[PDB]
């Protein structure tokens, strides 16, 4: 019911559009101030301009950046602190480029690393550093289904995301005395993979998705930490 999160500061990356989007839209609705990041100006300017138009009153600033590079995240955790700090994160990516695992190069192991890997990494390490200086503080990973059965055609996802469960892992386990959890939800796989049954036989909509995000995000799961939460129709099963 009430999620106790009016004010707080939500970062939410890759949030121009799709999950990200969707989750910072959900967290506005419950008086979130948002920080989003991705790599286009002009769109990230256009999805503020959205959620101000469905929002009365909310507050909505810019860091336009690539996940790839930790020193554009570490602007994105500057402009945080300037705002208060981190007090919620969303970490949302894009998917890596579909292939077989005989059929990827080294440079497409290096680039998988520095999309998916590396960014959830440093994402959640300047995160900490915020969130632990409060001593409260909501970090929601959204990763793939790949986590739980490998898919032939998406070695790269398969592979390289998994380091993105062992940081939700880690940062759970390290920053549970000090108020501060560490979850991931597993939405849909076209949701997050790029490819090119599902028991409850559709593939989800992202305010669904965002539902689940908001509920992680919030004063009430204080309790729940290191959780990976298949949000997907049953297809996990
Ligand atoms: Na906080
Ligand atoms: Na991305």
């Not at 503020?48 to 996940?67: C, K, T």
């Not at 939700?168 to 991931?184: I, Q, S």
């Given at each position: 019911?009430?999620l106790?999160i009016?004010?707080?500061?939500?970062?939410?990356?890759?949030?121009?559009s799709?999950?990200?989007?969707?989750?910072?839209?959900?967290?506005?609705?419950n008086?979130?101030?948002?920080?989003?990041?991705?790599?286009?100006?002009?769109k990230?300017?256009?999805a503020?301009?959205?959620?101000?138009s469905?929002?009365?009153?909310?507050?909505?600033?810019?860091?336009?950046?690539?996940?790839?590079?930790?020193?554009?995240?570490?602007?994105?955790f500057?402009?945080?602190?300037?705002?208060?700090?981190?007090?919620?994160?969303?970490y949302?990516?894009?998917?890596?480029?579909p292939?077989?695992?005989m059929?990827?190069?080294?440079?497409?192991?290096?680039?998988?690393?520095?999309?998916?890997?590396?960014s959830?990494v440093?994402?959640?390490?300047?995160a900490?550093?915020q969130?632990?200086?409060?001593?409260?503080?909501?970090?929601?990973?959204?990763?793939?289904?790949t986590?739980?059965?490998?898919?032939?055609?998406?070695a790269?996802?398969?592979?390289?995301r998994?380091?993105?469960?062992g940081?939700?892992?880690?940062?759970?386990?390290?920053?549970?005395?000090?108020?501060?959890?560490?979850?991931?939800?597993?939405?849909?796989?076209?949701?997050?993979?790029?490819?090119?049954?599902?028991?409850?036989?559709?593939?989800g909509?992202?305010?669904?998705?965002?539902?689940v995000?908001?509920?992680?995000?919030?004063?009430?799961?204080?309790?729940?930490?290191?959780?990976?939460?298949?949000?997907?129709?049953?297809?996990?099963?």
């Amino acid at each position: 019911m009430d999620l106790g999160i009016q004010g707080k500061l939500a970062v939410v990356t890759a949030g121009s559009s799709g999950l990200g989007f969707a989750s910072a839209l959900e967290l506005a609705r419950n008086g979130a101030r948002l920080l989003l990041f991705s790599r286009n100006r002009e769109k990230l300017e256009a999805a503020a301009s959205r959620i101000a138009s469905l929002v009365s009153g909310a507050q909505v600033d810019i860091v336009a950046g690539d996940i790839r590079e930790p020193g554009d995240i570490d602007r994105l955790f500057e402009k945080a602190r300037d705002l208060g700090g981190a007090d919620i994160l969303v970490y949302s990516t894009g998917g890596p480029r579909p292939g077989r695992f005989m059929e990827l190069g080294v440079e497409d192991w290096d680039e998988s690393y520095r999309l998916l890997a590396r960014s959830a990494v440093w994402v959640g390490r300047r995160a900490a550093e915020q969130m632990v200086e409060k001593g409260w503080g909501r970090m929601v990973y959204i990763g793939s289904v790949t986590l739980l059965r490998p898919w032939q055609d998406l070695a790269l996802s398969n592979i390289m995301r998994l380091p993105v469960i062992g940081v939700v892992r880690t940062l759970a386990l390290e920053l549970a005395p000090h108020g501060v959890t560490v979850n991931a939800v597993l939405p849909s796989l076209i949701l997050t993979d790029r490819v090119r049954r599902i028991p409850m036989g559709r593939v989800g909509k992202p305010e669904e998705l965002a539902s689940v995000v908001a509920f992680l995000a919030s004063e009430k799961a204080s309790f729940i930490t290191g959780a990976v939460i298949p949000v997907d129709g049953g297809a996990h099963i």
